[PDB]
Design a protein around this ligand. Structure first.
Ligand code: ATP
Ligand code: MG
Ligand code: MG
Lengths: 83, 105, 55, 117, 395, 148, 33
RNA sequence: CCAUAUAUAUAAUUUUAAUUAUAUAUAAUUUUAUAUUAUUUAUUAAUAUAAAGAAAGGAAUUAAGACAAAUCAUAAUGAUCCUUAUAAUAUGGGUAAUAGACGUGCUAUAAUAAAAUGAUAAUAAAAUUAUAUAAAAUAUAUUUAAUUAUAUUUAAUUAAUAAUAUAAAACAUUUUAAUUUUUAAUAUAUUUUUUUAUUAUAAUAUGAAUUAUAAUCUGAAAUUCGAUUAUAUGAAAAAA
């Protein structure tokens, strides 16, 4: 029930896998880099996150090129190929 | 010191286990040209190994990784029968036969 | 590793000098393979037999 | 007629699949070495160890001989059964009267089965 | 039963149905009465050893009512004589996998409880290197501290050791920490310990915030080092995982894997082994146990002088710093020799009396042949694989 | 060759003994039934681990318990296409093992060894639904005896 | 068929390259200097 | 004739795998002694027991009919046809286009099963290298190293010598959604890598098609239309 940028995760979900799974631009390496930047230990889980940490994760994700922005980039590239 | 420099500069051409330095030359058309080439390279290597005036390859450890790989690509029979396991008491004992005794004496 | 890189580089340069080997620490693509590549011309041309035969 | 060597050892050679084994059997206290390694280190599978034991325990002489086995080729089971057959052939020398007993246990017959095209 | 096989046997309490049996109690000074005979740890010893984690999984301890051991002349007597005689009491226990290195460590702990020594045991140090417990950076201690691991370890030290010994040793200087205990947390922000008026037993019972807990651990270790009233035995099992895992699974802000010595647990362990941290009793000792579940480098063999140094061996397979540290302290190797046929006879006798042997083993087999059979199957004396030959060999 | 004293004594002592068995036929057959893809050691490990739980929860010889279980559960004869036909030891063991494996798979443990060992423990204590299957097979055989 | 390897114990004591040089000298490459 | 088991010869055991290699030769279609049941009743089969046995498998090797053939690409000869064309050369394209339809295989749909790791290197066979193979090392992905892929450079070997190439499963530890069967805070314990108590806590961390970016390999040339790497994507696939 942990909510980050309108995306829900179960408490037991591992952060470095969950962020990669439920966000468009983040993969394994990007999720690991974000977690290392935020100081979370490698196998930290969502239910352990404090609200300030959730907001920090949200800010870090927002500074990334992800979700709608990356989808629009890919769609624009495909359209340019079509053009 | 000169020998250590020789071995260091040999690089993959030197084998520390067998202590052999081997060079192969086939670039030239004839074998005599390759023999001259190998001899000249040996003289160059020896001359500059014997040279220690401005040469400081004592602190460079000898590298054997190539030899390690070459030996690793071969089977080893290093083991031997344990020494203490041997029991000479049970060895066959030759048995007297008078026939050869009289034939020879 | 513990041994410094400068010593190994000097060893490599000098050894390459002795054995008439070219030393390229930069890693730049000089293309020496082409110069050292063996020629396959005569064997390829000899595929069908020597052309001088009694007819 | 086979006989022991100058060190009192019976030397035998056995085969199984592509594996070959050469075993020196001497009188001793049941110690075994394989390729200069402990039996349990070389053979991780218990079944192979029991296969190697079986000819010794058929003649109930387990713990009365020391075995130095030397294998090469094939895999674990093949090497173990080659050791088995070689150990049987070596044991026959120490007491020929037991040969039939060993022969009736099935350890003195080469397993001629091998991979076929 | 829901857990897997190994965790099933470990945690299913399958020793509840074990035979109620009595054995001689183990005491080193009385080794002659117990030499070459299976023994059970004293009732006091079990409580200390269990907290220390001396008895671990996959040791076939569920067969019996409580874990037992054989007091071996060449393994227990030989090591314990060295641990009470040698001037430098730094030892590393090595051998083939499953030869009984943990058992000798457990016996070494049992001696420590007998001789009133305080034991600091780190079992499975992978808990602070795998990365499944949280960590934080401290700057006063220019080190990485892991509060989750420390809080458990602090509690293990207290219960594993008698309060009487912890009561005696007295604080050298004032210590003040952040306080989290609930009666006095909001009432008073800090807890002030005092020189020669509070004792280290209070230190073990101090409750600090997770980040201050890094100070609590170093304060304890330094205190036990300075005092000379009680001997301290720092012990590490599964040490090879520390040696062959030079870099932990934690990454700093730059995604650089954190070095082992950067972590507090790593530096504390190596400081004691290297000898930088000097325990002052004089009978304090360091015992380390190799294991076969860990990968093998050239680090330990070079540290012990078994093989020469080859500088061209990659850092993955050779860590010079650990060799320098292990060589700085005059560490010696005690290799657990494999069981001889006679010791195998003693163990199987006890197994027969525990009704763990199978029917075929006991019925119709000439007893001498069975010893010859299982001496062979064990690999000429491996205790684990002897035990597997009896209990996990159904063919 | 004239056999010496020790050789003849050895021959007499040994000929006064039977030959040891290479393998327990029933346990080997069960293992091969557990086996897939030629991974014999995995099947042996699973079987031995299940038997080890059976011993640890019953404290009696688990090999004997397994054979009591297979002997009692397995049907002596079975109706086939409809006439009864007798079943030899291996067929009975196979049917019993399949019945055992179904109930084992019905259990909760992620490890098959734990499930199998606990199922065998329950069977050794006379608690299993496969007795009903055996009873139904025997009842059908009784009903169709007339067509032997 | 035969092969004879001779071991002689004794006392201690560029067609493509030629072509490349010629092309570099040619007025189709030298004109780009 | 293979394979198997032996014997002789050969190898100055550094071309070492003498546990091997290839020449010659031998051996088996197994031989026997009884018991029981059948028998054309023994000088016979079925078995079973005992004894000597290493001895248990395999291929090839002939004609006679009959059908099917033109990628009969399994050919020859002949018949007929083109001879500025149905012959011949060059450039590019196509043989890869997709509504569909059916075969053949590979990868999957999770815990009797996948992933990571396992340097004094767990354990093979048969091959291949003068129109080659590419060792070890250095550098970049990339990060202390390792792994993996390229780049630089060619060490030996033209070979029982060196390389392709440290075989992998196996075995050991750890992790693994569904699963509140888990993790976390306090306590707790003679289960401590662990137990207990109170609160908190249909496609996944299977699958990798498809799509995007940027690099790399061969070749003169990778657009139609090749392979490879990393960073994003993450479909269908569950029951019968
Ligand atoms: N002296 C002994 N008395 C009784 N049992 C023993 C003895 N020595 C070893 N064992 C048993 O043998 C097995 C060895 O386990 P242990 O953990 O001690 O081995 P190890 O060599 O330290 O293994 P690892 O390398 O896996 O850590 C266990 O079953 C232990 O109970
Ligand atoms: Mg141990
Ligand atoms: Mg995946």
């Amino acid at each position: 029930v942990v909510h980050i940028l309108g995306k829900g995760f179960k408490g037991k979900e591992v952060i470095k896998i969950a962020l990669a799974s439920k966000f468009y631009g983040i993969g394994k390496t990007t999720a690991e880099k974000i977690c290392s930047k935020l100081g979370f230990y490698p196998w930290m889980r969502m239910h352990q996150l404090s609200e300030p940490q959730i907001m920090s994760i949200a800010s870090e994700l927002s500074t990334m090129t992800i979700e709608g922005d990356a989808r629009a980039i890919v769609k624009d590239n495909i359209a340019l190929k079509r053009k | 010191k000169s020998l250590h420099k020789f071995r260091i500069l040999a690089r993959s051409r030197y084998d520390h286990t067998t202590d052999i330095f081997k060079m192969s030359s086939d670039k030239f058309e004839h074998a005599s040209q390759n023999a001259r080439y190998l001899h000249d390279i040996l003289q160059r290597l020896l001359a500059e190994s014997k040279d220690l005036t401005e040469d400081d390859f004592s602190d460079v450890p000898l590298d054997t990784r190539h030899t390690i790989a070459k030996s690793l690509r071969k089977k080893k029979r290093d083991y031997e029968f344990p020494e203490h396991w041997k029991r000479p008491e049970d060895a066959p004992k030759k048995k007297f036969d008078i026939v050869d005794q009289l034939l020879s004496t | 590793m513990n041994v410094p890189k400068a010593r190994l580089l000097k060893v490599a340069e000098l050894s390459a000098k002795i054995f008439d080997q070219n030393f390229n620490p930069s890693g730049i693509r000089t293309g020496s393979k082409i110069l050292n590549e063996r020629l396959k011309g005569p064997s390829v041309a000899s595929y069908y037999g020597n052309p001088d035969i009694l007819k | 007629i086979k006989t022991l060597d100058e060190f009192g050892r019976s030397i035998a050679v056995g085969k199984r699949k592509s594996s070959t084994a050469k075993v020196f059997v001497v009188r001793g206290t049941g110690e075994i070495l394989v390729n200069g390694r402990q039996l349990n280190d070389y053979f991780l599978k218990m079944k192979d160890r029991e296969s190697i034991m079986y000819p010794l325990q058929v003649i109930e002489s387990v713990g009365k001989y020391n075995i130095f086995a030397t294998t090469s080729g094939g895999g674990p089971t093949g090497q173990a059964e080659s050791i088995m057959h070689a150990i049987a052939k070596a044991l026959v020398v120490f007491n020929p009267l037991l040969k039939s007993r060993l022969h009736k246990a099935g350890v003195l017959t080469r397993d001629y089965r091998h991979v076929e095209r | 039963l829901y857990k897997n096989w190994t965790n099933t046997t470990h945690t299913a309490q399958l020793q509840q149905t074990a035979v109620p049996l009595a054995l001689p109690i183990f005491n080193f000074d009385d080794i002659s009465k117990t030499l070459n005979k299976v023994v059970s740890y004293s009732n006091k010893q079990y409580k200390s050893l269990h907290h220390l984690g001396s008895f671990k999984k996959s040791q076939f301890n569920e067969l019996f009512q409580k874990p037992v051991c054989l007091v071996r002349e060449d393994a227990t007597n030989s090591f314990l004589k060295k641990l009470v005689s040698h001037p430098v009491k730094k030892f590393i226990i090595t051998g083939e996998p499953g030869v009984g290195k943990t058992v000798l460590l457990s016996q070494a702990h049992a001696y420590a409880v007998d001789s009133k020594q305080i034991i600091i045991n780190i079992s499975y140090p992978e808990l602070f290197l795998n990365g499944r417990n949280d960590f934080s950076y401290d700057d006063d201690l220019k080190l990485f501290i892991q509060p989750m691991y420390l809080k458990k370890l602090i509690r293990k030290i207290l219960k594993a050791n008698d309060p009487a010994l912890l009561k005696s040793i007295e604080l050298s200087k004032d210590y003040k920490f952040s306080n989290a205990n609930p009666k006095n947390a909001s009432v008073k922000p800090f807890v002030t310990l005092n020189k020669t008026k509070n004792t280290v037993l209070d230190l073990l019972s101090v409750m600090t915030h997770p980040h201050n807990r890094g100070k609590l651990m170093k304060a304890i270790i330094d205190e036990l080092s300075v005092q000379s009233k009680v001997p301290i035995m720092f012990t590490v099992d599964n040490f090879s995982k520390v040696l062959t895992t030079a870099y932990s699974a934690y990454r700093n802000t730059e995604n650089k894997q954190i070095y082992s010595l950067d972590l507090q647990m790593g530096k504390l362990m190596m400081d004691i082994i290297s000898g930088e941290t000097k325990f002052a009793n004089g009978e304090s000792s360091t015992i380390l146990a190799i294991s076969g579940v860990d990968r093998t480098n050239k680090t330990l063999p070079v540290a012990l002088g078994k093989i020469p140094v080859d500088p061209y061996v990659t850092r993955y397979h050779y860590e010079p710093k650990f060799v320098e540290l292990l060589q700085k302290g005059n560490v010696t190797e005690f290799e657990v020799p494999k069981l001889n046929k006679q010791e195998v006879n003693e163990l199987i006798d006890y197994y027969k009396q525990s009704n763990v042997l199978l029917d075929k083993d006991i019925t119709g087999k000439k007893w001498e042949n069975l010893i010859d059979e299982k001496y062979f199957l064990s690999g000429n004396g491996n205790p684990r694989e002897l035990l597997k030959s009896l209990v996990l060999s159904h063919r | 060759i004239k056999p010496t004293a020790e050789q003849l004594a050895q021959w007499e002592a040994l000929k006064s003994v039977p030959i040891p068995p290479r393998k327990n036929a029933t346990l080997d057959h069960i293992t091969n039934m557990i086996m897939r893809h030629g991974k014999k050691e995995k099947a042996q490990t699973i079987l031995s681990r299940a038997l080890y739980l059976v011993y640890c929860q019953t404290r009696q010889d688990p090999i004997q318990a397994l054979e009591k279980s297979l002997d009692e559960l397995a049907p002596l004869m079975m109706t086939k296409t409809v006439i009864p036909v007798p079943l030899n030891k291996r067929q009975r063991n196979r049917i019993a093992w399949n019945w055992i494996v179904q109930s084992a798979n019905q259990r909760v443990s992620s490890d098959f060894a734990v499930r199998l060992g606990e199922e065998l423990t329950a069977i050794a204590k006379g608690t299993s639904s496969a007795f009903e299957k055996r009873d139904q097979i025997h009842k059908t055989a009784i009903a169709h005896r007339a067509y032997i | 068929g035969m092969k004879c390897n001779f071991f002689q114990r004794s006392e201690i004591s560029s067609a493509v390259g030629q072509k490349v040089l010629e092309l570099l000298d040619s007025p189709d490459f030298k004109k780009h200097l």
